[PDB]
Design a protein around this ligand. Sequence first.
Ligand SMILES: Nc1nc2c(ncn2[C@@H]2O[C@H](COP(=O)(O)OP(=O)(O)NP(=O)(O)O)[C@@H](O)[C@H]2O)c(=O)[nH]1
Ligand SMILES: CCCN1CCN(C(=O)c2c[nH]cn2)C[C@H](Cc2ccc(-c3ccccc3)cc2)C1=O
Ligand SMILES: [Mg+2]
Length: 171
Amino acid sequence: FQGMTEYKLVVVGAGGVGKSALTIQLIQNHFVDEYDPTIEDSYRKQVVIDGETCLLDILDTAGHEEYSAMRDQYMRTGEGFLCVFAINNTKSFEDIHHYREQIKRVKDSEDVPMVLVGNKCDLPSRTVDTKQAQDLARSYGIPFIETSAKTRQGVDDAFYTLVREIRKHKE
Ligand SMILES: Nc1nc2c(ncn2[C@@H]2O[C@H](COP(=O)(O)OP(=O)(O)NP(=O)(O)O)[C@@H](O)[C@H]2O)c(=O)[nH]1
Ligand SMILES: CCCN1CCN(C(=O)c2c[nH]cn2)C[C@H](Cc2ccc(-c3ccccc3)cc2)C1=O
Ligand SMILES: [Mg+2]
């Protein structure tokens, strides 16, 4: 034993779905009301999951980005991916297929650890039903979790679930 296990997590999805708000709620216990578009930012947190101490290295990505060799390079180093849409934005849900294809291409694999995240569950303007998102996740063989970065519903669960998926794949 030379130190805690490290997990490299990448958060992807369309512009404005709440990738940064989810990550800042996890790290700082703070809700960000402002919309400041991301290029690329990285965070670390030590947590205990299923009795194992580990270090989460989290990469928060841009939601609007043309083809970039530099974006492919950091995605290749990711071990697992949170694929985020907003439950009030149907286009962000339709964009999930494109994120999943991008990940499979860069990792050269059909079997990459991933969790589908439906964020902004606190808002009254739902356009994507729970059953539709659950059906999509079942079709991919991955978990689905509903979150709110404002209330904190599901935030720890999304990240911890992704770690559990990475552990299953290693074993
Ligand atoms: N009501 C509510 N608002 C949210 C939630 N998550 C994010 N928001 C709001 O949505 C806006 C965009 O959030 P942000 O985290 O910056 O989105 P992003 O996916 O990181 N955008 P980008 O891809 O440009 O970096 C902000 O005004 C933020 O407060 C949520 O769960 N509920
Ligand atoms: C230290 C400077 C570089 N950073 C920036 C921020 N860090 C800091 O501690 C910090 C504190 N003050 C300012 N920065 C933690 C961060 C650790 C980290 C996160 C993510 C990844 C990753 C995940 C997926 C794919 C590829 C890579 C790999 C590593 C990091 O190493
Ligand atoms: Mg962001």
